Design an enzyme around this catalytic site. Structure first.
Site, PDB file in Angstrom:
ATOM      1  N   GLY A   3      45.070  47.605  37.563  1.00 32.58           N
ATOM      2  CA  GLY A   3      45.276  46.849  36.159  1.00 32.58           C
ATOM      3  C   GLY A   3      43.523  46.796  35.586  1.00 32.58           C
ATOM      4  CG  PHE A   4      42.427  42.978  36.418  1.00 33.18           C
ATOM      5  CD1 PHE A   4      42.716  43.169  37.365  1.00 33.18           C
ATOM      6  CD2 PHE A   4      42.289  43.169  35.275  1.00 33.18           C
ATOM      7  CE1 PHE A   4      44.358  42.532  36.876  1.00 33.18           C
ATOM      8  CE2 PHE A   4      43.506  41.841  34.949  1.00 33.18           C
ATOM      9  CZ  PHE A   4      44.357  41.503  36.232  1.00 33.18           C
ATOM     10  CG  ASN A   9      43.568  44.928  46.352  1.00 34.02           C
ATOM     11  OD1 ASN A   9      42.843  45.885  45.483  1.00 34.02           O
ATOM     12  ND2 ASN A   9      44.141  44.099  45.637  1.00 34.02           N
ATOM     13  CE  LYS A  23      47.312  45.310  44.693  1.00 33.85           C
ATOM     14  NZ  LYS A  23      47.979  45.854  43.040  1.00 33.85           N
ATOM     15  CB  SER A  24      48.901  48.330  51.676  1.00 28.18           C
ATOM     16  OG  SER A  24      49.523  48.635  50.896  1.00 28.18           O
ATOM     17  CB  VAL A  37      37.275  52.553  42.334  1.00 28.63           C
ATOM     18  CG1 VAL A  37      36.305  52.940  43.532  1.00 28.63           C
ATOM     19  CG2 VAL A  37      38.289  51.473  42.051  1.00 28.63           C
ATOM     20  CG  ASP A  90      45.649  41.333  43.544  1.00 25.75           C
ATOM     21  OD1 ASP A  90      46.850  41.619  43.155  1.00 25.75           O
ATOM     22  OD2 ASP A  90      44.662  42.318  43.044  1.00 25.75           O
TER      23      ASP A  90
END
Ligand SMILES: CC(C)Nc1cc(Nc2ncc(C#N)cn2)ncc1C(=O)NC[C@@H](F)C(C)(C)O
Length: 290
Positions: free
Chosen positions: A34-35, A152, A149-150, A38, A147
């Site tokens: 969302g931010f 991350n 999550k998989s 990559v 945050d």
């Protein structure tokens, strides 16, 4: 501790002018959140991951997350966390340079994105352990990830789990915010209500453990049920069992250790934050599992 300052123009060149097409179609894009987006990069003999911050509705705000990512990165360096090599400020164009992860994210490996073979139950237990150790190091250092999550949880050549994305990270079981930030599919009940507690990170890790067991993403719009948490209800309400959901893409999976990981997940997923185990206990139960 002190990071290398790259110039925006060096990063443009190294990423083929931030070529947004996926690496699958000959671009430089490895993923997006969302931010930010990559990109694959080739800086001075080193393959790198360049995260270029961007509104995917956020203001700046974005720069607050940039200063926060560097601040946490300077204090938190560990075997189960990503390593920041550098940054770029130049105008509104903000970049963070990381170590290139040859096995991408856990989310992408569980879905076998780009033809990768499915992860063995053996590697899944190694990942769960490594991911838990990274969370322990963050908590021991009075930090909340916010945050978990998989997407991350990043992976090297040897499938060593490496926690990423510290833009929302906070130094520290009851603080308050306003303006809720994170990924809802993974978010703890209290987290959706403003509470900033390390116990929220544990809840999120339980969601990750269910994705590891099932090979299923936390939420899927084209699936019945949409939410992986609804399948947890079905197990606890005898309508289905864990065996009815163990990832069919495994062969080395033994119901013994699978039920053990589900037991840990179940405790992580306690509705009431104080009934949830701390990270050191989660670590104990996962080392007990193997
Ligand atoms: C984008 C993701 C799905 N993917 C990655 C993230 C990454 N590093 C990175 N480090 C730290 C942070 C942060 N905050 C973001 N990204 N390095 C490589 C990847 C990546 O996609 N590597 C390629 C492999 F997935 C494979 C060859 C199987 O496509």
């Amino acid at each position: 501790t002190r990071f290398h300052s790259f110039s925006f123009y060096e990063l443009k060149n190294v990423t083929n002018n931030f070529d947004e097409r996926p690496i699958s179609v000959g671009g430089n894009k490895m993923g997006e959140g969302g931010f930010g987006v990559v990109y694959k990069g080739y800086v001075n003999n080193t393959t790198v991951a360049v995260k270029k911050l961007a509104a995917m509705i956020t203001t700046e705000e974005l720069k607050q997350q940039f200063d926060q990512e560097i601040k946490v990165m300077a204090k938190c360096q560990h075997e189960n966390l990503v390593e920041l090599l550098g940054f770029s400020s130049d105008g509104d164009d903000l970049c963070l340079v990381y170590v290139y992860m040859p096995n991408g994210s856990l989310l992408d490996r569980l879905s076998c994105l780009d033809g990768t073979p499915p992860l063995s139950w053996h590697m899944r237990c190694k990942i769960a352990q490594g991911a838990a150790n990274g969370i322990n190091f963050l908590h021991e250092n009075h930090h909340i990830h916010r945050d978990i999550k998989s997407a991350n949880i990043l992976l090297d050549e040897a499938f060593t789990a490496k926690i990423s994305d510290f833009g929302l990270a906070r130094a520290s079981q009851t603080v308050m915010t306003s303006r809720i930030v994170g990924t809802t599919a993974y978010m703890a009940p209290e987290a959706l209500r403003g509470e900033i507690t390390p116990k929220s990170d544990i809840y999120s890790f339980g969601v990750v453990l269910l994705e590891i067991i099932t090979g299923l993403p936390a939420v899927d719009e084209h699936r019945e049920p949409q939410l992986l948490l609804d399948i947890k209800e079905e197990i606890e309400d005898e309508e289905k069992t864990i065996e009815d959901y163990i990832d069919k893409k495994m062969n080395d999976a033994d119901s013994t250790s699978v039920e053990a990981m589900y037991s840990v997940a179940s405790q992580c997923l306690h509705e009431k934050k104080n009934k949830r185990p701390d990270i050191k206990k989660v670590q104990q139960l996962l080392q007990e599992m193997t």
